[PDB]
Write a protein that binds this ligand. Structure first.
Ligand SMILES: Nc1nc2c(ncn2[C@@H]2O[C@H](COP(=O)(O)OP(=O)(O)NP(=O)(O)O)[C@@H](O)[C@H]2O)c(=O)[nH]1
Ligand SMILES: [Ca+2]
Ligand SMILES: [Ca+2]
Ligand SMILES: [Mg+2]
Length: 166
């Protein structure tokens, strides 16, 4: 049994908590309670390997973000989340990527770009734009919905598969 330390980052309200809770607890959180710093742990079998996921759900709200960098340091792979109906959250990804590079002191950190809320039709970030951003970082882009479960396993398990490539 291997442990994978995953960290979920991104702007306030994009659905980091809802994603993590859908993965771990199999329900959708409809309300919006801003996070400070929460952790989740679960044993899961991923590609035939029994492993322990330790997931750090981080704050996106500036007001709640004290010491996020000290949490982020510990991470082995990052889910960089934006919402497909929130163009500013997508623009913000560059700054999260810069933060991750600064806390890991590496240009080569396991990451997945996640476009969440794909159940919603008020899309302002087209798939291709995010594909392009992810291509520039040499990482995958995956769309998710914490509400329907679309892509949610695939996002987190892809991040583990990325960690295994480094
Ligand atoms: N339709 C839809 N709503 C979503 C989805 N994911 C999250 N939401 C909603 O968006 C709001 C914010 O979600 P939440 O998970 O709290 O966002 P967050 O990124 O963790 N916010 P913070 O950074 O403040 O902790 C909630 O009302 C939640 O139900 C999704 O995939 N689809
Ligand atoms: Ca609910
Ligand atoms: Ca550093
Ligand atoms: Mg949250």
């Amino acid at each position: 049994m291997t442990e994978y330390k995953l960290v979920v980052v991104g702007a306030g309200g994009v659905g980091k908590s809802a994603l993590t809770i859908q993965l771990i607890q199999n329900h959708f959180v409809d309300e919006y309670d801003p996070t400070i710093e929460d952790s989740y742990r679960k044993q899961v079998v991923i590609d035939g390997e029994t492993c322990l996921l330790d997931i750090l759900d981080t704050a996106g709200q500036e007001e709640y973000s004290a010491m996020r960098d000290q949490y982020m340091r510990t991470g082995e792979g990052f889910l960089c989340v934006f919402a497909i109906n929130n163009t500013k959250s997508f623009e913000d990804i560059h700054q999260y990527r810069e933060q991750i590079k600064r806390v890991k002191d590496s240009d080569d950190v396991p990451m997945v770009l996640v476009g969440n809320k794909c159940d919603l039709a008020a899309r302002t970030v087209e798939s291709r734009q995010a594909q392009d951003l992810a291509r520039s970082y040499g990482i995958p882009y995956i769309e998710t919905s914490a509400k329907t479960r679309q892509g949610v396993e695939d996002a987190f398990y892809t991040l583990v598969r990325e960690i295994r490539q480094h």
